[PDB]
Design a protein around this ligand. Structure first.
Ligand SMILES: Cc1ccccc1-c1cc(N2CCN(C)CC2)ncc1N(C)C(=O)C(C)(C)c1cc(C(F)(F)F)cc(C(F)(F)F)c1
Ligand SMILES: CCCCCCCC/C=C\CCCCCCCC(=O)OC[C@H](O)CO
Ligand SMILES: CCCCCCCC/C=C\CCCCCCCC(=O)OC[C@H](O)CO
Ligand SMILES: CCCCCCCC/C=C\CCCCCCCC(=O)OC[C@H](O)CO
Ligand SMILES: CCCCCCCC/C=C\CCCCCCCC(=O)OC[C@H](O)CO
Ligand SMILES: CCCCCCCC/C=C\CCCCCCCC(=O)OC[C@H](O)CO
Ligand SMILES: CCCCCCCC/C=C\CCCCCCCC(=O)OC[C@H](O)CO
Ligand SMILES: CCCCCCCC/C=C\CCCCCCCC(=O)O
Ligand SMILES: CCCCCCCC/C=C\CCCCCCCC(=O)O
Ligand SMILES: CCCCCCCC/C=C\CCCCCCCC(=O)O
Ligand SMILES: CCCCCCCC/C=C\CCCCCCCC(=O)O
Ligand SMILES: CCCCCCCC/C=C\CCCCCCCC(=O)O
Ligand SMILES: CCCCCCCC/C=C\CCCCCCCC(=O)O
Ligand SMILES: CCCCCCCC/C=C\CCCCCCCC(=O)O
Length: 485
C-alpha cells in the first residue's frame, strides 16, 4: 500500500481524535458547568461523552498504527488496555443512552411512576461502569505480548479449549450486549414514545380560533339556521358509527333518555359520521322524530369541521377506546368545551376545569353530563372556553418539545447503529463464511474501523444541530472565533 494512502488514513483518524475530544469535552463543560443543565438525562449524556472521548483519546492512534504496521511496540499494559477499554467504553456509552431512553419512556408512558433522582442516576452510572469493566475484564486478563514466532504481537491468549469455544461465546455475548440487545430495547422504547407523541400532535396553524370570524354566538346562530334549527345549547359528535369503539350508540341511548325530559327542548344535536347501518338508521329515525337533532353522513372538509368546533357549545366524545384523543385537542383549541369518556388520552388531556368527563359505556351518566352542560350554559362560559384553549395549547407545547428531544436521541441511536454495523459484520463474517482472501481487506478494514471509531465524534455535533441549549453552549465555548457574537 502506497505511503500517500497511509498519510491520508492517518489524517482521517486524526480528525476523529481531535473532533471527538474537543466536542465531548465541550459537551461535558456545557452540562457540568451550567446548573440548569444538570438533569438525569444530561448526566447520562455526560457519562457517554466521557466514555467516547476517552476511547478516542486513548485507543484510536494505536489501533490505526497497529492496523497499518502489524508489530506491537507499545508494551504489555497498553496491550491489555488496547483489548480491554473499547468494550468497557462502548458498553458504558450505549447503556447510558439506554438509560436516557428508559427515562423518557417513563416520563411519557407512565408519568405517575417515580423516576430516578440525580443521586440515583449517579449510582446507576457507577453500576454501568462496574458491569462494563467486568465484561471487558477477560480480554484484558488474557491479552499478552509475544513473538509469533519471531515478531512481537499483542494477542488475546484464551485458555486452549474445544476449538476456541470460550472466545466464540465471549465474542457473541459481547456483540449482543453492546449492539443487538441495547438497540432492540432502545428501538422498542422510542417506537412507543415516538408514536405516542406524534399521535398526540395537532397542527395549531390550522386548528386555531383566530381563523374564525365574528362572535361565537353569531356563528352558532348562523350554523343552526343553516341546519334549520332554532337557537339553543348545541352538542356535536363526530366519529365512526360502530359498537364498542367510538360510542355513538351510547350517545343515541343518551338522546333517547333525554328526549322525555323538558330540558330536551333547549338542546340541539349534530351527529356526524357513518358506519354500521343499524346505527345510521337509528340516528336518522332520531333525526326525523325530533326537530332539534341533525345527522350528517356525508364526508366534511376539515374547514367545515373547524367551523363547527368554533360554533357549537360542546363536543361529545363517548369513546370506549381512545388512546390519544387528538379530537379533544381539536375541539378545545376552537373553544368547544369537551364532554368525553374518561379513557386513555381523553382522561389525560381533559381536566375538571377544562371539560366534563364520564364513565365509558354508560348512557345515563352521559345524559346527566349533558344536563350538567345545559345548567352551565345558563351562565357565561367564556372562562371555561379560555381554560379549554389554554390547556390544549400548553399540552401541545409540551408534545412538540418532547418530540424534538426524542428526535435528537433517535438520531443518536441510529448513528451508533450505522457506525457499528459494518464492524460487527466484519468480525462475525468468519463464522458465517470464513473467507477474509485479501481482496483489498486491509483497505476495507481501515474503512470499517474508521467508521466505528468515528462514532465517538458525532454526538456533540448532533446536540449542536438539534438542541438550542447545546448550540448556545457551543457558541459560548467558541465565542473567540469570528462567527459568534
Ligand atoms: C471481542 C469482540 C467484541 C465485539 C466485537 C468484536 C470483537 C472481536 C472478535 C475477534 N474474534 C472472533 C471473530 N474471528 C475473527 C476470530 C477472532 N477478534 C477481535 C475482536 N476485536 C475487534 C476486539 O477484541 C477489540 C480490539 C478489543 C475491540 C473491540 C471493540 C468493540 F467494542 F466493538 F467490542 C471496538 C474496538 C475498536 F473500536 F477500538 F477498534 C476494538
Ligand atoms: C473508569 C471510568 C469511571 C467512570 C466514573 C464516572 C464517570 C463520569 O464522569 O460520569 C458521572 C457523571 O459525570 C455524574 O455527574
Ligand atoms: C493518527 C496517528 C498516526 C501517527 C502516524 C505514525 C506513523 C503511522 C504509520 C506507520 O507506522 O507506518 C509504518 C510502515 O510504513 C508500515 O508499513
Ligand atoms: C406499539 C406501539 C403503539 C403505541 C403504543 C402506546 C399507546 C398508549 C399511549 C399511552 O399509554 O399514553 C398515555 C399514558 O399511558 C397515560 O399517562
Ligand atoms: C409487542 C409490542 C406491543 C407494544 C405495546 C406498547 C404499549 C405501551 C403503552 C402501555 O403499555 O401503557 C400501559 C400503562 O399501564 C399506561 O399507564
Ligand atoms: C430481547 C429483550 C427484549 C427486547 C425488547 C424490549 C422491550 C421492552 C423492554 C422494556 C419494557 C418496558 C418497561 C416497563 C416500565 C415499567 O415499569 O412499567 C410499569 C407497568 O408495567 C406499567 O403497567
Ligand atoms: C445518521 C442517521 C440518520 C438516519 C435516521 C435518523 C433518524 C431520523 C429521525 C426522524 C424522526 C424519527 C421520529 O419519529 O422522532 C421524531 C418524532 O417527531 C417523535 O414522535
Ligand atoms: C445486561 C443488562 C445490563 C444492564 C446495565 C444497567 C443499566 C440499565 C439501564 C437501563 C436499561
Ligand atoms: C415486546 C416486549 C415487551 C413490550 C411490552 C412491555 C410493556 C411494559 C409496561 C408498559
Ligand atoms: C481506566 C481504568 C481501566 C483501565 C484498565 C485497562 C487495562 C488494565 C488491565 C485490566 C486487566 C488486568 C488483569 C490482571 C492481569 O492481566 O494479570
Ligand atoms: C447475552 C447472551 C446472549 C446470547 C449468547 C448466546 C451464546 C452463544 C453460544 C455460541
Ligand atoms: C436498529 C434499531 C435502532 C434504532 C432505531 C430506533 C427506533 C425508533 C423508531 C421510531 C419510529 C417512530 O417514531 O414511529
Ligand atoms: C429505522 C428507524 C428510522 C428512524 C425513525 C423514523 C420515523 C419517521 C417515519 O418513519 O415516518
Ligand atoms: C442531522 C444532525 C447532524 C448529523 C451528523 C452526522 C450523523 C452521522 C451520519 C453519518 C455518519 C457516517 C456515515
Amino acid at each position: 500500500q502506497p505511503a500517500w494512502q497511509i498519510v491520508l488514513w492517518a489524517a482521517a483518524y486524526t480528525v476523529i481524535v481531535v473532533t471527538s475530544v474537543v466536542g465531548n469535552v465541550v459537551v461535558m463543560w456545557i452540562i457540568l458547568a451550567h446548573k440548569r443543565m444538570r438533569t438525569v438525562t444530561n448526566y447520562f449524556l455526560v457519562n457517554a461523552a466521557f466514555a467516547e472521548a476517552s476511547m478516542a483519546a486513548f485507543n484510536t492512534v494505536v489501533n490505526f498504527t497497529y492496523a497499518v504496521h502489524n508489530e506491537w511496540y507499545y508494551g504489555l499494559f497498553y496491550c491489555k488496555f488496547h483489548n480491554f477499554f473499547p468494550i468497557a467504553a462502548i458498553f458504558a456509552s450505549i447503556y447510558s443512552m439506554t438509560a436516557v431512553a428508559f427515562d423518557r419512556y417513563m416520563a411519557i408512558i407512565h408519568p405517575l411512576q417515580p423516576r430516578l433522582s440525580l443521586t440515583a442516576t449517579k449510582v446507576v452510572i457507577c453500576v454501568i461502569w462496574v458491569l462494563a469493566l467486568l465484561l471487558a475484564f477477560p480480554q484484558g486478563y488474557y491479552s499478552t505480548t509475544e513473538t509469533m514466532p519471531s515478531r512481537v504481537v499483542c494477542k488475546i491468549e484464551w485458555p486452549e479449549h474445544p476449538n476456541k469455544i470460550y472466545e466464540k461465546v465471549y465474542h457473541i455475548c459481547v456483540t449482543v450486549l453492546i449492539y443487538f440487545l441495547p438497540l432492540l430495547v432502545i428501538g422498542y422504547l422510542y417506537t412507543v414514545v415516538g408514536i405516542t407523541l406524534r399521535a398526540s400532535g395537532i397542527d395549531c396553524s390550522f386548528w386555531n380560533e383566530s381563523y374564525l370570524t365574528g362572535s361565537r354566538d353569531e356563528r352558532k346562530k348562523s350554523l343552526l339556521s343553516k341546519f334549520g334549527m332554532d337557537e339553543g345549547v348545541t352538542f356535536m359528535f363526530i366519529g365512526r358509527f360502530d359498537r364498542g369503539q367510538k360510542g355513538v350508540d351510547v350517545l343515541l341511548k343518551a338522546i333517547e333518555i333525554l328526549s322525555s325530559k323538558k330540558e330536551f327542548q333547549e338542546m340541539r344535536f349534530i351527529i356526524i359520521g357513518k358506519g354500521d347501518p343499524e346505527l345510521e338508521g337509528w340516528a336518522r329515525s332520531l333525526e326525523e322524530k325530533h326537530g332539534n337533532v341533525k345527522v350528517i353522513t356525508e364526508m366534511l372538509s376539515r374547514e367545515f369541521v373547524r367551523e363547527l368546533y368554533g360554533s357549537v357549545d360542546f363536543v361529545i366524545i363517548p369513546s370506549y377506546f381512545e388512546p390519544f384523543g387528538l379530537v379533544a385537542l381539536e375541539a378545545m383549541c376552537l373553544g368547544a368545551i369537551p364532554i368525553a369518556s374518561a379513557v386513555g388520552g381523553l382522561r389525560d388531556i381533559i381536566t375538571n376545569e377544562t371539560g366534563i368527563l364520564v364513565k365509558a359505556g354508560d348512557p345515563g351518566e352521559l345524559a346527566n353530563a349533558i344536563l350538567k352542560a345545559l345548567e352551565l350554559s345558563r351562565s357565561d362560559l367564556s372562562k371555561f372556553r379560555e381554560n379549554c384553549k389554554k390547556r390544549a395549547m400548553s399540552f401541545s407545547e409540551q408534545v412538540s418539545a418532547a418530540r424534538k428531544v426524542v428526535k435528537m436521541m433517535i438520531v443518536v441511536v441510529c448513528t451508533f447503529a450505522i457506525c457499528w454495523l459494518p464492524f460487527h459484520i466484519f468480525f462475525l463474517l468468519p463464522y458465517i463464511n470464513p473467507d477474509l482472501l485479501k481482496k483489498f481487506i486491509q483497505q476495507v478494514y481501515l474503512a470499517i474501523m474508521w467508521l466505528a471509531m468515528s462514532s465517538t465524534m458525532y454526538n456533540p455535533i448532533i446536540y449542536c444541530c438539534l438542541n438550542d441549549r447545546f448550540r448556545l453552549g457551543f457558541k459560548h465555548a467558541f465565542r473567540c472565533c469570528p462567527f459568534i457574537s
